[PDB]
Amino acid sequence: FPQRYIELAIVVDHGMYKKYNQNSDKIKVRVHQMVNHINEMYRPLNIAISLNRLQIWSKKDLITVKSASNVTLESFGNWRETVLLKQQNNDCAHLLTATNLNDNTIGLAYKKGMCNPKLSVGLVQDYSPNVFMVAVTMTHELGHNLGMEHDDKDKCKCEACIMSDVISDKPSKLFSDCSKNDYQTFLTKYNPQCILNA
Numbered sequence: 001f002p003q004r005y006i007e008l009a010i011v012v013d014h015g016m017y018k019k020y021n022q023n024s025d026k027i028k029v030r031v032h033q034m035v036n037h038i039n040e041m042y043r044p045l046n047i048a049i050s051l052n053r054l055q056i057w058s059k060k061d062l063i064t065v066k067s068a069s070n071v072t073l074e075s076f077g078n079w080r081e082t083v084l085l086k087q088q089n090n091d092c093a094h095l096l097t098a099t100n101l102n103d104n105t106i107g108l109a110y111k112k113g114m115c116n117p118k119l120s121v122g123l124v125q126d127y128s129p130n131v132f133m134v135a136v137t138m139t140h141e142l143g144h145n146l147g148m149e150h151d152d153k154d155k156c157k158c159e160a161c162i163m164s165d166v167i168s169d170k171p172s173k174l175f176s177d178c179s180k181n182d183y184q185t186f187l188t189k190y191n192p193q194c195i196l197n198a
């Protein structure tokens with residue numbers, strides 16, 4: 001895998017702001033540890049994730065965060081294209097929410113959306129006190145932005161690789177051969193030009 005670089009914007013909604021008792025510091029330690037974990041998991045693919053911006057919605061949410069994860073994701077996507085990309089540019093943005101999403105969904109993202117002004121977006125729920133667990137979900141969702149599918153464990157031969165549809169009790173920090181071929185195919189076939197330079 002040739003070197004790639006993602007400028008990632010992470011935005012924390014108001015609900016998560018109140019959960020951590022309005023403490024930005026506490027939010028920031030969580031977010032930097034997460035970025036460290038993500039980079040750790042993306043190292044074998046030669047992708048460098050750089051936290052280009054952390055926006056915490058402390059006054060109020062700038063979009064209505066709804067339990068329906070696909071409706072929230074789409075609202076966020078437009079807000080990125082429409083507002084966020086106008087102030088500071090980034091290759092991808094993920095919303096971290098404390099909101100309980102419908103049907104035990106803890107994360108959602110647009111497949112092959114990397115670099116797109118509307119689609120390079122993702123959503124993950126701060127569902128665990130453990131930063132590593134929330135970081136595995138963010139890595140997984142980032143995996144979909146980069147064209148990765150779930151693992152058909154049967155033929156991918158992995159039980160708890162990053163792309164398993166259900167997050168394991170003890171996720172491994174590894175990508176399956178299947179995920180690597182998908183990412184390889186993403187680069188080859190779509191080649192997002194925004195991730196070429198650092």
Ligand SMILES: [Zn+2]
Pocket residue numbers: 140144150165
């Ligand atoms: Zn998934």
